[PDB]
From Swiss-Prot:
Protein family per UniProt: Belongs to the heat shock protein 90 family.
Residues covered by region (Interaction with NR3C1): 1-209
Domain of life: Eukaryota
Posttranslational mods: ISGylated. S-nitrosylated; negatively regulates the ATPase activity and the activation of eNOS by HSP90AA1.
Residues where ATP binds: N36, D78, K97, F123
Function: Molecular chaperone that promotes the maturation, structural maintenance and proper regulation of specific target proteins involved for instance in cell cycle control and signal transduction. Undergoes a functional cycle that is linked to its ATPase activity which is essential for its chaperone activity. This cycle probably induces conformational changes in the client proteins, thereby causing their activation. Interacts dynamically with various co-chaperones that modulate its substrate recognition, ATPase cycle and chaperone function.
Name of the protein: Heat shock protein HSP 90-alpha
UniProt subcellular location: Nucleus; Cytoplasm; Melanosome; Cell membrane
Comment field on protein domains: The TPR repeat-binding motif mediates interaction with TPR repeat-containing proteins like the co-chaperone STUB1.
SUBUNIT field: Homodimer. Identified in NR3C1/GCR steroid receptor-chaperone complexes formed at least by NR3C1, HSP90AA1 and a variety of proteins containing TPR repeats such as FKBP4, FKBP5, PPID, PPP5C or STIP1. Forms a complex containing HSP90AA1, TSC1 and TSC2; TSC1 is required to recruit TCS2 to the complex. The closed form interacts (via the middle domain and TPR repeat-binding motif) with co-chaperone TSC1 (via C-terminus). Interacts with TOM34. Interacts with TERT; the interaction, together with PTGES3, is required for correct assembly and stabilization of the TERT holoenzyme complex. (Microbial infection) Interacts with herpes simplex virus 1 protein US11; this interaction inhibits TBK1-induced interferon production.
Modification N6-acetyllysine occurs at: K43, K69
Organism classification: Eukaryota, Metazoa, Chordata, Craniata, Vertebrata
Amino acid sequence: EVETFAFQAEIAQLMSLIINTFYSNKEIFLRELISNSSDALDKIRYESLTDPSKLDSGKELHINLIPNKQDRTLTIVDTGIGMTKADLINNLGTIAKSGTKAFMEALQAGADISMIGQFGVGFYSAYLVAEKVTVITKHNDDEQYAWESSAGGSFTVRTDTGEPMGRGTKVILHLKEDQTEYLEERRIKEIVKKHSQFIGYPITLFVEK
Ligand SMILES: Brc1ccsc1-c1cc[nH]n1
């Protein structure tokens, strides 16, 4: 059973700007997603200090980057705190409204798209390179869900029946046809070294078979 939701108008506006604006420096999407993973890992690490059983769903705190050329996907996996259904439908978009307005105003004042993370809406930079984004996520207090959007104003949420994740979030970038450079080992390595070199969790770049 699949539920379909409309983005808030401000967030749809932001996604169209990201998809339609000419902007060559697309590689910053990966810094933003890794940063979000790092923040989620920080949150479960902090919570586990007062309730160690929150790590019963998995003690390892890490980030994996998995390219797949056959499916044309780049997947960013983390074992962070994960997202509830309420986060996916309501909470994250509510938080994002204010950051979106501020970001769109800054852009009109001369900021550029690479500053998106300073406004808390860096996830949407995924649409610089992805035609579709799938997010599989599992919080300790909720079931495993799959969120998906190809933009256009709507997203879906369903319970996920795939492989159980334990805890954390998998962001699956279905890359645009002309963005397959982000499946290349040498390119991902270059980007992580330039933008993400001091992230405090192990980042493993998987190689393709
Ligand atoms: Br946003 C967000 C909110 C709770 S978890 C999470 C996340 C985890 C990986 N990326 N984003």
